[PDB]
Amino acid sequence: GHMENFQKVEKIGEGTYGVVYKARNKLTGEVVALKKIRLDTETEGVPSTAIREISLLKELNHPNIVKLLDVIHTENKLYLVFEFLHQDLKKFMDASALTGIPLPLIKSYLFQLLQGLAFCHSHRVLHRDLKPQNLLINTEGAIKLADFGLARAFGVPVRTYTHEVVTLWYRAPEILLGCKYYSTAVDIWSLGCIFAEMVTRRALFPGDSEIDQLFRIFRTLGTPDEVVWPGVTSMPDYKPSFPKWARQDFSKVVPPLDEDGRSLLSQMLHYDPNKRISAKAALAHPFFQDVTKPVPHL
Amino acid sequence: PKTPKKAKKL
Amino acid sequence: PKTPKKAKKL
Amino acid sequence: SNEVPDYQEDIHTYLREMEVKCKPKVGYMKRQPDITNSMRAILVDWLVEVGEEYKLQNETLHLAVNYIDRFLSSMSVLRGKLQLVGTAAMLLASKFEEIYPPEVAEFVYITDDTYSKKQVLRMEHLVLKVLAFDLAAPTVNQFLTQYFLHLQPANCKVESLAMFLGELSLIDADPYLKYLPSLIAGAAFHLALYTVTGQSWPESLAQQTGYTLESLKPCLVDLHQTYLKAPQHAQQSIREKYKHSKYHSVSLLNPPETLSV
Ligand SMILES: Nc1ncnc2c1ncn2[C@@H]1O[C@H](COP(=O)(O)OP(=O)(O)O)[C@@H](O)[C@H]1O
Ligand SMILES: [Cl-]
Ligand SMILES: [Mg+2]
Ligand SMILES: [Mg+2]
Secondary structure (H helix, E strand, O other): OOHHHEEEEEEEEEOOOOEEEEEEEOOOOOEEEEEEEEOOOOOOOOOHHHHHHHHHHHOOOOOOEOOEEEEEEOOOEEEEEEEOOOEEHHHHHHHOOOOOOOHHHHHHHHHHHHHHHHHHHHOOEEOOOOOHHHEEEOOOOOEEEOOOOOOEEOOOOOOOOOOOOOOHHHOOHHHHOOOOOOOOHHHHHHHHHHHHHHHHOOOOOOOOOHHHHHHHHHHHHOOOOOOOOOOHHHOOOOOOOOOOOOOOOHHHHOOOOOHHHHHHHHHHOOOOOOOOOOHHHHOOOHHHOOOOOOOOOO | OOOOOOOOOO | OOOOOOOOOO | OOOOHHHHHHHHHHHHHHHOOOOOOOOHHHHOOOOOHHHHHHHHHHHHHHHHHOOOOHHHHHHHHHHHHHHHOOOOOOHHHHHHHHHHHHHHHHHHHOOOOOOHHHHHHHOOOOOOHHHHHHHHHHHHHHHOOOOOOOOHHHHHHHHHOOOOOOOHHHHHHHHHHHHHOOOOHHHHOOOOHHHHHHHHHHHHHHHHHOOOOOHHHHHHHOOOHHHHHHHHHHHHHHHHOOOOOOOOHHHHHOOOHHHOOHHHOOOOOOOOO
16 A cells, blocks of 8 residues: 555664564555655665665565565655565574574575575676575575665676675675675675574674674685685785684584585685685585475574 | 665765 | 766756 | 676576566657657767766666666657756666766756756656666666677777767667667677677677577668768767777777678
8 A cells, every 4th residue: 555554563673774664554454564765864866775675676586585565655755565574584593592593494594595696696686785684584484585775786797896895794805805896706605604603603703893804704714825716915905914824624613514514615605706606506515405494483 | 783884985 | 976077958 | 706607698588588678669759749869869968978977887878778768658758858857867877877876966067957956856756656666677788798708808999899889879769779789789799899800790699699690680780870970970979988098999990881791
């Protein structure tokens, strides 16, 4: 319906860009998520983030991507109506921090995230803000990519896009080091971080500044050099004075993971964007041979 | 951290 | 980006 | 970053599917009571100059033209409002495509206060409503970009020339509205390649696109004429733009006399 046909049930989300309510259609009873966007305080019209989010979501019809159901555009207000999902992965991880997420469920979620992401990339969309709070789970075992406010249509080949992309902890090294070009690999990096986070119940690289983030990565994966990453010493923010740390053994990093899991994770956190595994290839990894769709305990 | 914002241009 | 130059009514 | 191989084919296939949906009506101008192809040409040529003033991407220009043709395909517009539609389209294309879109006040300024901020913003709303927010259109630009990958090693002069030819197609609705962006891109690429190196549309592209050099012919004949008559055309913003060394001054190159093809 319209403004008047929705009953607001509660504020369920706040973010950099949107005011989000759980609401119900008074006429059909359907429960939805309402993302409110003020054009007010807006003397520039419809925000580019909303313009990209809406236009890209309309092209992204997939089981593992949140559904945009309606757009209500008025003089002062812009409302995005989404299907409602039970909760985000962040809330689920916190509720699971004591016990842990069962490995079969971690595998199912990653498999589904890769399917959503590979769908995006195949439709020339970069997400650019993959983090647990932007991933939505339902009660039946599904997980979906949400929050396309930072998303972008990309060209082949790629152009220089926005430097300020991705929440810090999930930000890829090519971005931190200041490459002008970046691509699909930045989404894979984020997913790798999220994988490791599900397994260990902790953020993999919780930096508190750009250089702290970069060193946390170096301390874990080893300081990159021209051999593992040709060109790295030429990046705009690279400094020859960076400490040279050695790579840690992954059994020390993600103890609970078997050889296949460690293999896949290492490939998702490859330094060189050109060799970092793609969503599509990741889906073919032996790690997923036995994948099922378990229900989470909510 | 929060989602980052575009640096001001000029 | 922006490097304004001139103003025309068509 | 530099590598693009995994989703390359998927993206090309997807774009080929989008282009036959995000399509404007070939002869929609006959049904406009007050505006003509000549007015459209003047509008686009102006938008080229605007894009230069503000250092907007070529993609942004192609997108704006796409929006304009789709909007005019279903809305009657009086001549005195045509520039307002074009301004709103450029603003929207900028918001979609640019890192730094110019602000609305700046757009009002380059029309020389012909319209108010309120009008531009209200028009933005109307265009969004009429296009149903479907802004992620495929353009001649996107197809060229992919085609360029078949050039090894890369040839910057060929790329600038192809872009130049692609941009000239935007000015004249007759006859270019009747060709899909992928086909225009194909004829442009072949024509640029041929002019600069004497080589022809590659079999690898023919395979990928399904277009043989024969299927390019009709469009290629038109594009060749357009190229030959460019110095004569009433609209000159594109030639001026591509005289710059930024684009290897390709608009100063002489077209080939014949194609023998
Ligand atoms: N469809 C939805 N169903 C349930 N919760 C949602 C939905 N969309 C968003 N949320 C919640 O609202 C929060 C903000 O949503 P998001 O669209 O990511 O806003 P922002 O752009 O402000 O981050 C999310 O972290 C999520 O927890
Ligand atoms: Cl999060
Ligand atoms: Mg979010
Ligand atoms: Mg967001």
